[PDB]
Amino acid sequence: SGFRKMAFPSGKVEGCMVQVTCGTTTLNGLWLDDVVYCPRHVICTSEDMLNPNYEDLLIRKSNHNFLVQAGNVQLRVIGHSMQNCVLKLKVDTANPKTPKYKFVRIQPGQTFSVLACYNGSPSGVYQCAMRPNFTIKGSFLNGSCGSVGFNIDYDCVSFCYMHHMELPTGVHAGTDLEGNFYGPFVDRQTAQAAGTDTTITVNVLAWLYAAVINGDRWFLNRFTTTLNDFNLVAMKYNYEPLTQDHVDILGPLSAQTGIAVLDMCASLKELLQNGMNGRTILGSALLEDEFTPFDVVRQCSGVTFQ
Amino acid sequence: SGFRKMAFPSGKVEGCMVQVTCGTTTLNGLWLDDVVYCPRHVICTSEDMLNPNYEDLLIRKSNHNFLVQAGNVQLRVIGHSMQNCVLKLKVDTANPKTPKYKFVRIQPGQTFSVLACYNGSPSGVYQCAMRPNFTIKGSFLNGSCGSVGFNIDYDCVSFCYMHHMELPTGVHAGTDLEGNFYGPFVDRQTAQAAGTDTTITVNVLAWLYAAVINGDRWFLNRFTTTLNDFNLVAMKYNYEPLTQDHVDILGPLSAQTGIAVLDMCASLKELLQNGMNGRTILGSALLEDEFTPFDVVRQCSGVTFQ
Numbered sequence: 162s163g164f165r166k167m168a169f170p171s172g173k174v175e176g177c178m179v180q181v182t183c184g185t186t187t188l189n190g191l192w193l194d195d196v197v198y199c200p201r202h203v204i205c206t207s208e209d210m211l212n213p214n215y216e217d218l219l220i221r222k223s224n225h226n227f228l229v230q231a232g233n234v235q236l237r238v239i240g241h242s243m244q245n246c247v248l249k250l251k252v253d254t255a256n257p258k259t260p261k262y263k264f265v266r267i268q269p270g271q272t273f274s275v276l277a278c279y280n281g282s283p284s285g286v287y288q289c290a291m292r293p294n295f296t297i298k299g300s301f302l303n304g305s306c307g308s309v310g311f312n313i314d315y316d317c318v319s320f321c322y323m324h325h326m327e328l329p330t331g332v333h334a335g336t337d338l339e340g341n342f343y344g345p346f347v348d349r350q351t352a353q354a355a356g357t358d359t360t361i362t363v364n365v366l367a368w369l370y371a372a373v374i375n376g377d378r379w380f381l382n383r384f385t386t387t388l389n390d391f392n393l394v395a396m397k398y399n400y401e402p403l404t405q406d407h408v409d410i411l412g413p414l415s416a417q418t419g420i421a422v423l424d425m426c427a428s429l430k431e432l433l434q435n436g437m438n439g440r441t442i443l444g445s446a447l448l449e450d451e452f453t454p455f456d457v458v459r460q461c462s463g464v465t466f467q
Numbered sequence: 468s469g470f471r472k473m474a475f476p477s478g479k480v481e482g483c484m485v486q487v488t489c490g491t492t493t494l495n496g497l498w499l500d501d502v503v504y505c506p507r508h509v510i511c512t513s514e515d516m517l518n519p520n521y522e523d524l525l526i527r528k529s530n531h532n533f534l535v536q537a538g539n540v541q542l543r544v545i546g547h548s549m550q551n552c553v554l555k556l557k558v559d560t561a562n563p564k565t566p567k568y569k570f571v572r573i574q575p576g577q578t579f580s581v582l583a584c585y586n587g588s589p590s591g592v593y594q595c596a597m598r599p600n601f602t603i604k605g606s607f608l609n610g611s612c613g614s615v616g617f618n619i620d621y622d623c624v625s626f627c628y629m630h631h632m633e634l635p636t637g638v639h640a641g642t643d644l645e646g647n648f649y650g651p652f653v654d655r656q657t658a659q660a661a662g663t664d665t666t667i668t669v670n671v672l673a674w675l676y677a678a679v680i681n682g683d684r685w686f687l688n689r690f691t692t693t694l695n696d697f698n699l700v701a702m703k704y705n706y707e708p709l710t711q712d713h714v715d716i717l718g719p720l721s722a723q724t725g726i727a728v729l730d731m732c733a734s735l736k737e738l739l740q741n742g743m744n745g746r747t748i749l750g751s752a753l754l755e756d757e758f759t760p761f762d763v764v765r766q767c768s769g770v771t772f773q
């Protein structure tokens with residue numbers, strides 16, 4: 162029993178983190194086989210960051226301009242290239258700790274673990290779900306650029322996120338490991354800001370099923386609703402539309418609990434209209450939307466507790 | 468910026484987790500140097516669990532009754548002994564991945580990371596703070612016994628918790644690594660239940676300082692209060708008393724933010740008396756008490772954002 166915001170065990174990723182220094186800038190890199198991946202803005206001065214042409218900045222560098230430190234060992238840089246917003250530093254040694262891995266791009270509403278790192282040294286691990294507006298609500302301090310986000314699927318690490326910057330609302334923006342930004346953000350100094358966000362409805366429904374599996378049942382009701390009438394209330398409260406594919410995805414949780422998806426939808430409508438009246442669900446006084454149906458199934462493989 | 472419930476990177480602990488099987492029971496063990504530590508209830512049948520005499524049960528076992536599997540390698544058990552509620556299995560191989568470590572007992576109100584494991588395989592990592600009533604609100608399914616809780620101090624792992632059982636309210640009870648239970652709980656089947664709990668006041672104040680460091684300021688006020696008058700309101704809302712040592716501990720956060728501890732106390736009193744009026748703090752609609760002052764300082768080393 163119990164329900165926690167749980168991250169994947171981080172060891173496989175810790176064994177890949179290195180420190181990359183160029184000039185007076187230090188940030189983190191990801192060392193897989195004989196390549197080190199990091200944000201290309203490592204090659205920028207502050208004046209550069211104002212309006213950089215990275216192809217120009219990079220042609221003025223050589224391999225020896227990049228100091229890579231893996232723990233207590235300096236790695237010899239033997240090639241460099243740019244792929245979109247990431248720099249690829251070819252090094253003369255393959256990382257003996259490389260896990261099985263893939264570079265996957267995730268969708269808004271999906272979750273991943275973040276290994277926050279400073280100076281190539283891991284400092285903490287937490288779960289973060291990509292927001293509909295393609296930002297993440299992370300916890301990052303100066304120096305954390307290059308920290309990565311990932312899921313682990315069996316023994317395979319799917320990297321999905323590399324951290325690049327903080328937007329003015331305090332939320333975070335970055336790229337996939339192909340260097341393509343999530344969202345309409347750029348690695349240069351502009352007035353760029355997060356667009357409007359919405360709540361991830363399928364996740365909120367998943368979390369209500371988690372609550373039922375864990376014995377919180379006060380919000381259930383006898384009512385049902387139709388998909389269209391539900392989505393009419395969703396729109397009003399800045400919730401994403403629920404689709405038939407979402408309903409299908411919630412199938413297993415519905416079956417385990419014996420609560421139809423559209424019945425749980427009627428509970429959610431009531432919660433949106435009435436609030437909680439001083440009660441909590443799984444320790445929260447707000448409706449939580451950063452657990453996907455898969456996250457709930459993985460963590461709640463336990464008894465439904467009728 | 469940002470504030471997340473962050474766990475310590477788990478690799479150093481992942482490298483110590485093994486599977487311990489006795490009879491038809493499998494649970495997790497912790498392999499440090501040439502010893503494997505696990506819950507002694509691994510030696511119990513269900514009928515045994517009803518009312519066991521563990522000294523009797525253990526004298527009837529031999530080394531070959533214990534199968535230890537470290538990944539794909541069976542470890543040869545060459546000695547066994549009991550220390551309080553933990554079993555110590557001496558094995559013929561020292562774990563080459565043993566970190567620098569210590570066995571520390573923590574205090575109620577302190578936090579730690581949990582590496583939830585099944586069949587010797589790590590499945591997730593999350594942050595859990597020992598409650599005043601010596602339970603933890605974890606996320607554990609059958610098979611998770613033997614999973615450990617820990618802090619990491621530089622490269623040294625301080626183990627503080629081994630998981631043993633779930634109480635009827637769905638909260639979790641266990642021991643330090645010396646096998647001494649936290650709280651008035653026993654590793655046998657009884658009607659045992661969690662005693663009444665309270666909120667960890669110093670942690671709530673720490674988290675309010677985190678909120679200020681992160682730009683949530685709506686709950687601040689011009690008022691102050693005295694320590695005694697504050698503790699008079701605390702008692703009424705099931706909050707622990709605040710001590711002068713707690714105030715001293717909050718010193719650095721008070722200095723960074725320029726908000727006196729007793730002024731922040733007046734904000735907390737107002738929040739307790741009035742609620743939040745539909746607003747949130749650091750993404751929560753409840754006052755959070757599972758971050759210690761040290762956790763806030765470690766994660767918020769960042770700009771105060773005046």
Ligand SMILES: *C(=O)NCCCCCC
Pocket residue numbers: 188202210302303304305306307325326327347348349350
């Ligand atoms: C990373 O450690 N800091 C981010 C500073 C650079 C942002 C400009 C794109």
Ligand SMILES: *C(=O)NCCCCCC
Pocket residue numbers: 494508516608609610611612613631632633653654655656
């Ligand atoms: C651990 O995996 N399960 C706990 C079952 C035994 C509890 C009796 C003390």
